[PDB]
Design a protein around this ligand. Structure first.
Ligand SMILES: [K+]
Ligand SMILES: [K+]
Ligand SMILES: [K+]
Ligand SMILES: [K+]
Ligand SMILES: [K+]
Ligand SMILES: [K+]
Ligand SMILES: [K+]
Ligand SMILES: [K+]
Ligand SMILES: [Mg+2]
Ligand SMILES: [Mg+2]
Ligand SMILES: [Mg+2]
Ligand SMILES: [Mg+2]
Ligand SMILES: [Mg+2]
Ligand SMILES: [Mg+2]
Ligand SMILES: [Mg+2]
Ligand SMILES: [Mg+2]
Ligand SMILES: [Mg+2]
Ligand SMILES: [Mg+2]
Ligand SMILES: [Mg+2]
Ligand SMILES: [Mg+2]
Ligand SMILES: [Mg+2]
Ligand SMILES: [Mg+2]
Ligand SMILES: [Mg+2]
Ligand SMILES: [Mg+2]
Ligand SMILES: [Mg+2]
Ligand SMILES: [Mg+2]
Ligand SMILES: [Mg+2]
Ligand SMILES: [Zn+2]
Lengths: 100, 56, 69, 208, 99
RNA sequence: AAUUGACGGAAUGGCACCACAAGACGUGGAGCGUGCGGUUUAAUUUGACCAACACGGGGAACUUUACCAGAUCCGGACAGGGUGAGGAUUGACAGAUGGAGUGUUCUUUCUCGAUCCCCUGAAUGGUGGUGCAUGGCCGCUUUUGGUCGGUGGAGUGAUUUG
RNA sequence: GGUGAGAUUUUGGGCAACAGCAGGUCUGUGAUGCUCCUCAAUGUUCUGGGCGACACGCGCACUACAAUGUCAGUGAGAACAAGAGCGACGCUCCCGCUUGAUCAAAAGAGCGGGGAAACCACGGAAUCACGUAGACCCACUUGGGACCGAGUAUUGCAAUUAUUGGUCGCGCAACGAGGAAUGUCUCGUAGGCGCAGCUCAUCAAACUGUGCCGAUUACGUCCCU
């Protein structure tokens, strides 16, 4: 456990492309990788009355937001990590690098 | 000393009277979950842009 | 709708015509000019600020510092 | 350091305010949407428009004014925010642009039916599969009613109709009251992902 | 609190001309912060609103509002007025006028 | 005299636990929590009467607050007329006055220094009215299987076929 | 009937046409036309009251009328979730372990952890179980807990018209299964049992979700609506 890369997004397709291409860069250099880990997906929920005034049958709306997280572990030297993760990210994906 | 008295209670900053909707400044039926601070009527109109989707 | 009280007056500022002729006294002694009022010792006020000299106390217009006899 | 779920909510709230500020400011100009992206060196915001020259202004005066507004509001550091303008390939397939064009025509004292039929005819020529225009209010005297004008296909139920139908609503403030307009455009290809088939269409490949 | 001293009026006008845009939050118990080549200055939100309201009654200001925030922009007539008021040279223009 | 609806303690064929049948657990009787009406009150702010009545996300100590008894501020921009650096105006210690040892006003005399002040228009703000002037949204008709053109056929026609 | 994890829209939801209603909302908005007030103001703020006040009628909940029980012990055992930057040098939210303790609860104080699959946490929920050789024995009784008295600690700028929690008294307040009338429901459902979120400085007999124990009856009809 030298470098931990954590990616989170609200778009499932976007977060998979970032993970897959990051693995591509690591393999093209031949740096050892602990396979990507799919952390539990979270749902944020809000329930509100539909009416703006409070008349009629009491009906409700349910709104949901899904958050996807992926974890990739790399064991590589210092300057090698910046080279590997220097590429640009798609919109809506947050990437964080942590040294445990 | 009338300026010391002008908005003395509003300066304390506690209770329902210290919170405003960040869109319309109304003080009724706020949604405080996840620190949203949007009233329930304004949330329904802006829920799509914020990122909430009706699925179930 | 009925108040049963005299109406509030509004303050308005009292005008002292040529008020700067006081606070200064000139003597023939070429003339020598001395100030007839005291300055506020508060560092933030300065030498251009005078004291009210009420009947029984001295008062500063801006700092509101008061000296009672 | 804020948690991940708090950061996702904050980003959505920022985008919603930016969208509302732009649609109020860029009204009377073709406004079709905004894309916001974060980079290590700066933050990029792309504004989609039908009249790009109107958005840019003389030289780049108008677009620099918009940058100064956003930088001050969100406390952006100098050189950390940049704005771009790009044009829509097909103006007639944008529900937001068509609704604001209709609102301008109504304020210019035009007949309701003539104005609505003009938008529908332009959209159909642009290559849409269907169009729907609804106008409601005191169009006649003193008693509110509503009309609808239709053409072509349209789907209204299920979930797939959100990937294919573009809709927008606007308010028009006349001297006797407010009148609402709503425009729906059914587009070829999905707005979400291209090469997507309709939910209930089956095709059989011809044998070799 | 709506009594604006002359020194604060000149600082706000000078910041306005240099940038060309002023943004403020509608809040009676608020403070507005700005910088003029360093040397940050502050004044109550109510005083900023009074100055902009007077400018908008004249034909020198364009105003926009969205989500509890003001946005003020100078127009060509306002640029002319500010130049005489601040005794600037005829070649002076706000920012956003320079490529 | 004909046409389309609605209705029938007139027929035909189906359907539904917001219908029944076979049953279960309850409510209606008691205490208490909460909402509505009434009475009382200075005020007990107010909307709504299957599809109003733990509904207005309405579990209100102050705030919220819209009601009642009193006190302050201008947040009346701008335009015209007038006072105005020989001073237009702001604020205030101490004593009284007000419920109020942070000038509301009064006595007193310092402070600020063209930001105002007085008069006339205009303009702003309003949880003020009017939802029977409106937009948007929601409820219900209506949880069932229903709706509409084009061209062609029938009728003087309303209409009908599909 | 078979094959099968599952056998009929697989099981639950979401979406849902065309025509309307003088249904509701001008108390959501910098949505809005006419109209009203506009400097002793229907604008705004501050102090104090009220929104709750009680001879009564009505809707909806919670707790019971006991032994298929109450009280006191021992045993095993869930899911959904949440959590921190104006006014007072960082802090401000949610928890754990010690200590207080040579003597109640409720507090107070030290030391730590968590940005939440890393803390709380091996998540010791309540119905439940016990060959516990436990207490009670058909009575308005150790059923039931309304009403009321006295002392305490905490939230808050402020607790009187008791904010809330905890302690000892009151239990001689009804209530012993509820007339006419009436609601919901077909399988992990009804009923019973708790927990989290939300509103929230402090308060849940409410609502929105979640799990636990777990049935009787029908597989029809057009008699009533
Ligand atoms: K049938
Ligand atoms: K119903
Ligand atoms: K309406
Ligand atoms: K026909
Ligand atoms: K109105
Ligand atoms: K009430
Ligand atoms: K009633
Ligand atoms: K409630
Ligand atoms: Mg279809
Ligand atoms: Mg369907
Ligand atoms: Mg006849
Ligand atoms: Mg019934
Ligand atoms: Mg009863
Ligand atoms: Mg019905
Ligand atoms: Mg309360
Ligand atoms: Mg009050
Ligand atoms: Mg008011
Ligand atoms: Mg209003
Ligand atoms: Mg109406
Ligand atoms: Mg109306
Ligand atoms: Mg109506
Ligand atoms: Mg219905
Ligand atoms: Mg024909
Ligand atoms: Mg007991
Ligand atoms: Mg006790
Ligand atoms: Mg007790
Ligand atoms: Mg007893
Ligand atoms: Zn002094």
């Amino acid at each position: 456990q030298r470098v931990l890369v954590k990616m989170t997004s609200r778009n499932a397709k976007a977060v998979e492309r970032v993970v897959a291409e990051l693995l591509e860069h690591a393999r093209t250099e031949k740096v050892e990788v602990r396979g990507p880990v799919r952390l539990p997906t979270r749902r944020l929920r809000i329930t509100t009355r539909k009416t703006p005034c409070g008349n009629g049958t009491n009906t409700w709306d349910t709104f949901e937001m899904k958050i996807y997280k992926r974890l990739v572990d790399l064991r590589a030297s210092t300057e090698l990590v910046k080279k590997i993760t220097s590429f640009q990210i798609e919109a809506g994906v947050d990437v964080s690098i942590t040294i445990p | 000393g009338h300026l010391h008295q002008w908005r003395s209670r509003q300066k304390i900053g506690m209770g329902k009277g210290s919170r405003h909707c960040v869109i319309c400044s109304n003080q009724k039926a706020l949604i405080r979950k996840y620190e949203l601070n949007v009233c329930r009527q304004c949330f329904r109109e802006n829920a799509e842009n914020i990122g909430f989707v009706k699925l179930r | 709708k009925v108040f049963t009280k005299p109406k509030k007056p509004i303050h308005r500022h009292k005008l002292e015509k040529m008020r700067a002729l006081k606070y200064f006294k000139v003597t023939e002694n070429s003339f020598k000019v001395e100030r007839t009022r005291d300055e506020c010792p508060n560092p933030n006020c300065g030498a251009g600020v005078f004291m009210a000299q009420h009947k029984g106390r001295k008062y500063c217009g801006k700092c509101h510092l008061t000296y009672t006899m | 350091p804020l948690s991940k779920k708090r950061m996702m909510v904050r980003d959505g709230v920022f985008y919603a305010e930016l969208f509302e500020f732009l649609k109020r400011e860029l009204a009377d100009d073709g406004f079709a949407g905004v894309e916001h992206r974060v980079t290590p060196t700066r933050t990029e915001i792309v504004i989609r428009s039908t009249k790009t020259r109107e958005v840019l202004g003389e030289k780049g005066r108008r677009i620099r004014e918009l940058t100064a507004c956003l930088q001050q509001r969100f406390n952006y550091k100098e050189g950390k925010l940049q704005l771009f303008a790009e044009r829509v390939e097909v103006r007639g397939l944008s529900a937001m642009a068509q609704a604001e064009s209709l609102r301008f025509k109504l304020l210019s004292n035009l007949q309701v039916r003539r104005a609505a039929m003009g938008i529908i005819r332009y959209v159909m020529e642009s290559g849409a599969k269907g169009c729907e225009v609804t106008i409601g209010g005191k169009i006649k005297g003193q008693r509110a009613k509503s009309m609808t004008f239709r053409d072509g296909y349209m789907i209204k139920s299920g979930t797939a109709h959100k990937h294919f139908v573009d809709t927008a609503t606007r308010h028009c403030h006349l001297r006797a009251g407010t009148i609402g307009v709503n425009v729906k455009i059914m587009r070829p290809q999905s707005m979400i992902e291209e090469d997507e088939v309709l939910p209930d269409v089956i095709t059989v490949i011809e044998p070799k | 609190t709506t009594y604006v001293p002359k020194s604060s009026r000149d600082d706000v006008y000078r910041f306005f001309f240099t940038e060309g845009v002023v943004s403020c939050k509608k809040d009676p118990l608020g403070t507005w912060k700005g910088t003029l080549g360093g040397k940050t200055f502050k004044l109550p939100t109510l005083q900023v609103m009074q100055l902009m309201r007077s400018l908008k009654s004249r034909g020198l200001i364009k105003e926009q509002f969205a989500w509890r925030h003001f946005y003020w922009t100078l127009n060509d007539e306002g640029i002319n007025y500010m130049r005489k008021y601040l005794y600037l040279g005829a070649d002076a223009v706000p920012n956003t006028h320079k490529v």
